[PDB]
Amino acid sequence: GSSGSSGMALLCYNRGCGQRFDPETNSDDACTYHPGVPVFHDALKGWSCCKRRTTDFSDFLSIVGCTKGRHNSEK
Ligand SMILES: [Zn+2]
Ligand SMILES: [Zn+2]
Secondary structure, eight states, rough: OOOOSSSSEEOOSTTTTOOEEEEOOOOOOTBBBOOOOOEHHHHHHEESSSOEEEEHHHHHTTTOOOSOOOOSSOO
């Protein structure tokens, strides 16, 4: 019975996501990325898309997307 293999998980190419996703399920509200750009002011790394701002280089790359859409299977 053990079985679990797929082949429709497209890799997202949206800043902030870079995660996989399903096309047959993908929706305008299933992908959370940042339509803006990475900014660094006062040691506060963020994006010109949202108001989110963090000083931890780690958090910056974690900042969940502020926008919603369909995962980009293309760069
Ligand atoms: Zn954002
Ligand atoms: Zn995505």
